[PDB]
């Protein structure tokens, strides 16, 4: 386990957990698939949501009761189950078992309130914008409810502007954009709008590694050089000068130095050869842990340059 910093109540909690665990397993071997089971496991799963076998037991119980109960009784059971799940997620929102049981449950209902599930997501994501279990569940809900790529794109925009911790929202955007495109990597107009959105982010918070990672992808997602349009060429030159400005304001910022090299590659490898090499030396001094990566990147670019010069007529 993690985040555990360096007794009597612990010994009493354990003996209760042991007795209830004891009791559930006996009841299970005996084939007693009933609400008492549900009562027993609720006491354990609350503190201990990664005890997977007890989620299976709840499922076995609910499955059995669906046969030998009325529809209204079965409906009351699923609503109780949804409340229980929500209270488990409040105490531990990062358990595989809980989120899976919620999906299992929702997938077998006929008809689930999917808009309510999307709102649950928005709440958990206000609390922790990086919780990947909750983004996965959101993608599950959006698919089941056939929510359109454009609606989800609108959700991601609010999340990126309202605050940072944006790696998961930029990741989401990278999947959504290709979809409303679609294609059988990004059309120029879409790309240009995204470059503008990402460049806002990284001049708003140059710390903010997620926008730089996304921006590197955008730089490779074009139709490339030199089919550089005059608009894209201008945009990239203007990004280059803005990164140079930011370099003055933040001379220890490694992301803007790397991005300058990348932009020069995107613009004209051979024309900017001298400046590119200068930037590698500044970068290595600023981010010495990445020296090996940076030497290997520079070697790759120098080889590409040699190939470009050998292509001369």
């Amino acid at each position: 386990m993690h985040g555990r910093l360096k007794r009597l109540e612990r010994e009493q909690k354990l003996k209760l957990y042991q007795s209830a665990t004891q009791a559930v397993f006996q009841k299970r071997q005996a084939g007693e698939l009933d609400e008492s089971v549900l009562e027993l496991t609720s006491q354990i799963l609350g503190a201990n949501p990664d005890f997977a076998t007890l989620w299976n037991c709840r499922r076995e119980v609910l499955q059995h009761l669906e046969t030998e109960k009325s529809p209204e009784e079965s409906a009351a059971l699923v609503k109780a189950e949804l409340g229980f799940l929500e209270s488990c997620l409040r105490v531990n929102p990062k358990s595989y078992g809980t989120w899976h049981h919620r999906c299992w449950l929702l997938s077998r209902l006929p008809e689930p309130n999917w808009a309510r599930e999307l709102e649950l997501c928005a709440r958990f994501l206000e609390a922790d914008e990086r919780n990947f279990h909750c983004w996965d569940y959101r993608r599950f809900v959006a698919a089941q409810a056939a929510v359109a790529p454009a609606e989800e794109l609108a959700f991601t925009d609010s999340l990126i502007t309202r605050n940072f911790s944006n790696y998961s929202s930029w990741h989401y955007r990278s999947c959504l954009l290709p979809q409303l495109h679609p294609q059988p990597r990004l059309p120029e107009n879409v790309l240009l709008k995204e470059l503008e959105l990402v460049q806002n982010a990284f001049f708003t918070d140059p710390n903010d590694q997620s926008a730089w990672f996304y921006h590197r992808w955008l730089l490779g997602a074009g139709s490339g050089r030199c089919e550089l349009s005059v608009e894209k060429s201008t945009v990239l030159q203007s990004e280059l000068e803005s990164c140079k400005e930011l370099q003055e304001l933040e001379p220890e910022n490694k992301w803007c130095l790397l991005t300058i090299i990348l932009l020069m590659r995107a613009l004209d490898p051979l024309l900017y050869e001298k400046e590119t090499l200068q930037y590698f030396s500044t970068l290595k001094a600023v981010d010495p842990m990445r020296a090996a990566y940076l030497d290997d990147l520079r070697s790759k670019f120098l080889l590409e340059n040699s190939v470009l010069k050998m292509e001369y007529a």
């Binding site: 386990m1 993690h2 985040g3 555990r4 910093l5 360096k6 612990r10 010994e11 354990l14 957990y17 042991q18 397993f25 201990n48 990664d50 005890f51 997977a52 076998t53 989620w55 299976n56 499922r59 595989y96 899976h100 299992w104 990086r130 990947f132 983004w135 996965d136 993608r139 911790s165 790696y167 998961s168 990741h171 989401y172 990278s174 999947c175 710390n207 590694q209 997620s210 990672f213 996304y214 992808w217 010495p288 842990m289 990445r290 020296a291 090996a292 990566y293 290997d296 990147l297 790759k300």
Partner: protein
Amino acid sequence: QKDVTIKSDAPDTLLLEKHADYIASYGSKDDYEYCMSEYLRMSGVYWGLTVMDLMGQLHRMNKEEILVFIKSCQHECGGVSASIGHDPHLLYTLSAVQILTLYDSIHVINVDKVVAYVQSLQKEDGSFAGDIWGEIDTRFSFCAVATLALLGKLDAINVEKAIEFVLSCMNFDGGFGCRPGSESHAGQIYCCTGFLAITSQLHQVNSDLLGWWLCERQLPSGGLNGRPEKLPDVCYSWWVLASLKIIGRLHWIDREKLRSFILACQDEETGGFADRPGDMVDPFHTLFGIAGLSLLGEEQIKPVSPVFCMPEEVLQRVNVQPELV
């Protein structure tokens, strides 16, 4: 920015004899965390045994006792559970097979049944469910092919469909998540690159892109996180390094800085490693600390396979050593 700062009285030497003592004694002292982690016991046994073997101390654990325990954890469907009375799962099936492989005792279980179990969990899109309740995760794609590779039975699953699912999980940043659309995370990257090694598909990985993402996991403290903006954790010295090693980019990490971080995570009094300096120790982080140091070239520790997290001498014995990048 989020990082630990290592204190200057942090251990700076490898305390091998203490770590063997910690593991050899573990689960002997009604202990709370023991009791409470029964749901993963089989994997816990795998962590303890593997680390003892990397340290040359395997003989100090109880072979006879463990073989009987494993045998009693195999269910009629062929899958293995974490502990007696618990439900079978691909996670614990892999751990049991890894343990039996360490002990050269594979026919302690019914291998035909393990194979049929794994086969049964593959879905139409090539993904694997963890068990009968249908949770899909690239973690389970790796457990399936790793289990089958160790048994010589990789041909039993639909390999092309399996590869296609895993490649559908590859992201804008070169990494992999749990399912298609899922954000990259070092743990998942380990599972997916491990999978692509076993199935001979490492040429489909963008090694320079992924390698960059991985080496950017290293914080000024020298420790590695599992994704951007998170705290370092000694177990990422396994997930990230093993992935880097598989894709041929292990030298992209600052090795001395990471080594100093790993050693700082040791508890010099009790032995074992914690997730970060000053936290409580556990066998999970003890294995990944020691395995991480082995990958970095530590002479007191046996060479470890980056794919199977077992001593390489074991895998050489069963002739299962995937080519890496």
